[PDB]
Every structure is written in structure tokens, then in C-alpha cells.
Enzyme design. Structure first.
Site, PDB file in Angstrom:
ATOM      1  CE  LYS B   7      -3.603   2.168   2.853  1.00 50.05           C
ATOM      2  NZ  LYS B   7      -4.193   2.150   4.223  1.00 50.05           N
ATOM      3  CG  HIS B  12       3.015   7.364   0.229  1.00 52.46           C
ATOM      4  ND1 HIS B  12       2.323   8.558   0.213  1.00 52.46           N
ATOM      5  CD2 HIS B  12       2.471   6.628   1.228  1.00 52.46           C
ATOM      6  CE1 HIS B  12       1.406   8.545   1.164  1.00 52.46           C
ATOM      7  NE2 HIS B  12       1.473   7.387   1.795  1.00 52.46           N
ATOM      8  CE  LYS B  41      -8.029   0.458 -26.212  1.00 52.01           C
ATOM      9  NZ  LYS B  41      -9.129   1.459 -26.146  1.00 52.01           N
ATOM     10  CB  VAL B  43      -3.280   0.994 -30.068  1.00 56.82           C
ATOM     11  CG1 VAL B  43      -3.702   2.332 -30.640  1.00 56.82           C
ATOM     12  CG2 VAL B  43      -1.883   0.656 -30.562  1.00 56.82           C
ATOM     13  CG  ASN B  44      -6.955   4.416 -25.318  1.00 54.83           C
ATOM     14  OD1 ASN B  44      -8.072   4.006 -25.660  1.00 54.83           O
ATOM     15  ND2 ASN B  44      -6.790   5.468 -24.526  1.00 54.83           N
ATOM     16  CB  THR B  45      -6.793   7.779 -29.667  1.00 58.39           C
ATOM     17  OG1 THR B  45      -6.035   6.999 -30.598  1.00 58.39           O
ATOM     18  CG2 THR B  45      -6.652   9.254 -30.002  1.00 58.39           C
ATOM     19  CE  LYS B  66      -8.475   1.255 -38.013  1.00 55.28           C
ATOM     20  NZ  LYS B  66      -7.561   2.311 -37.464  1.00 55.28           N
ATOM     21  NE  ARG B  85       0.245   3.153 -32.655  1.00 55.30           N
ATOM     22  CZ  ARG B  85       0.049   4.332 -33.232  1.00 55.30           C
ATOM     23  NH1 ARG B  85       0.822   5.365 -32.913  1.00 55.30           N
ATOM     24  NH2 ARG B  85      -0.928   4.483 -34.112  1.00 55.30           N
ATOM     25  CG  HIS B 119     -15.248   1.565 -31.724  1.00 54.90           C
ATOM     26  ND1 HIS B 119     -14.434   0.700 -31.024  1.00 54.90           N
ATOM     27  CD2 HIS B 119     -14.781   1.576 -32.996  1.00 54.90           C
ATOM     28  CE1 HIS B 119     -13.517   0.206 -31.839  1.00 54.90           C
ATOM     29  NE2 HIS B 119     -13.705   0.722 -33.040  1.00 54.90           N
ATOM     30  CG  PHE B 120     -10.768   6.677 -31.090  1.00 60.03           C
ATOM     31  CD1 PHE B 120      -9.746   6.294 -31.949  1.00 60.03           C
ATOM     32  CD2 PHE B 120     -10.980   8.039 -30.865  1.00 60.03           C
ATOM     33  CE1 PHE B 120      -8.947   7.246 -32.585  1.00 60.03           C
ATOM     34  CE2 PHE B 120     -10.183   9.010 -31.499  1.00 60.03           C
ATOM     35  CZ  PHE B 120      -9.166   8.610 -32.360  1.00 60.03           C
ATOM     36  CG  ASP B 121     -13.134   2.755 -36.952  1.00 60.68           C
ATOM     37  OD1 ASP B 121     -13.270   1.593 -36.482  1.00 60.68           O
ATOM     38  OD2 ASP B 121     -12.948   2.984 -38.168  1.00 60.68           O
TER      39      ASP B 121
END
Lengths: 124, 124
Positions: B7, B12, B41, B43-45, B66, B85, B119-121
Site C-alpha cells: 500500500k 507513495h 490495452k 493502442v489507445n487514443t 475500419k 502505444r 467506439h474510437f475507430d
């Protein structure tokens, strides 16, 4: 069960402050480290020195804790740390913290065997 | 039950040199927004425009997703976005990301009623 719309906002939205500035550190870290769940932990400190260096504090200067317990120690030297304090604006579940970086001595409580840090008591 | 030492490290410890560096954005946000649970995850934007502005895309240019679905829309204007990424070094439970800021048009799938982003395409 999370709605697709909520999920999208969670995974893809961050207008609450662009990926700009170091002023956002605390807001992100307090959230990443789970201290904004059910309530905004009002104040928290993050240490950036090595785990070894912080652990080494358990064998440095002895000092009494703010709660009277007698298992507190103070680092022999300053450490780069980050101070996070909820802001007036902040109101759960919209936790807002002010990031303040300073290099101070830290006081921690130690416990267990081996005796390692188990509580951040203060920075001095 | 999380150990007291565990913890303390969670609450900290954040060892490193460029703590609040923007290069750390993705690592902190991907963690905060829970996209590192169970696995990383890939890839993510994160979009930094107004929620209202991103929802508006749903009534903008219709495009084919896509994956072949036909409920995608593309932003008329470019938007400030941060690309995240997973790095070759990254591997659960130690997720690591490369943060990349750019301005591009976004493509999102819209659904539900009212029709909002679900959804982010892609970005382009």
C-alpha cells in the site's frame, strides 16, 4: 454494467485538461493509484527516489510520529517528492489536486520484518 | 489483503527522473482510465476536445468503419489528440506506453439513442 457511451468517455476523453503541463501530475497519479475512489484523498505525497533509498530511511534518524507512535524515521537527506493537495474546486467524484514539487526530508513509519516504510508521516 | 508495504508503494512511490514529464502521460492515463487491468490495452487514443465537440462528430461526415461496420463518422475539423502505444518493453503487469501528441481528424462509431460516440475507430 458500463454503457458503451460511458466506456467511450472513460477510454477516449480528456478535455478536463489536454496532455499538456506537469500541473496535471497529481490528478492523473491520484487516480491511477486509486486514491479518488468513493472519496478524494485530501492530501498525498509521492517520492521519486529509489525504493532502496526510501527503505533505507527505516535505518536513519529516529523521530516520534505525529500520532504518538514511536516507529517513525526521518531521511538523512532531502528527496525529490511531489505534494498533492485537493483544491477548493475539487469535489468528489471530480477530484482536483494541486501539484507541487519540492525536495525535502521525509518522515515515514516503518514496520514488518524486514522493517520497511508502511506510512508516510510528513515531509520536512 | 494488500500488505502495508504494498500500500505504501502504491500510495507513495513513483521512482524515476521525469515524474511529471508529458512523456509519462499515457502511462498515467492508461492506468487511471483502467486500460491496464488484466492486461495492457495495446493502442489507445485520448481526445482533448470538448465532449460536446466530439459528440457533434456523430452528425458530421459519415464514413465506413475500419472493421466494415457502417456507423462511423469523421470529424470535420482536426482535433488535439494524444496517441498511446504499448512499447516493446511493456508487458503486463508492467504496462509501458509511448505518448504522442498530434492534431488529426477522428473517426468514431456512433450508436445508441441519442446517437453518441461508442467506439474510437481511427484518426487521420
Amino acid at each position: 454494467k458500463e454503457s458503451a457511451a460511458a466506456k467511450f468517455e472513460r477510454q477516449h476523453m480528456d478535455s478536463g485538461n489536454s496532455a499538456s503541463s506537469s500541473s496535471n501530475y497529481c490528478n492523473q497519479m491520484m487516480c491511477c493509484r486509486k486514491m479518488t475512489q468513493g472519496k478524494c484523498k485530501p492530501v498525498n505525497t509521492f517520492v521519486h527516489e529509489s525504493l532502496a533509498d526510501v527503505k533505507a530511511v527505516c535505518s536513519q534518524k529516529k523521530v516520534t510520529c505525529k500520532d504518538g507512535q514511536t516507529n517513525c524515521y526521518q531521511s538523512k537527506s532531502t528527496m525529490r517528492i511531489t505534494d498533492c493537495r485537493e483544491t477548493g474546486s475539487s469535489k468528489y467524484p471530480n477530484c482536483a489536486y494541486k501539484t507541487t514539487q519540492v525536495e525535502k526530508h521525509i518522515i515515514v513509519a516503518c514496520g514488518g520484518k524486514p522493517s520497511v516504510p508502511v506510512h508516510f508521516d510528513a515531509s520536512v
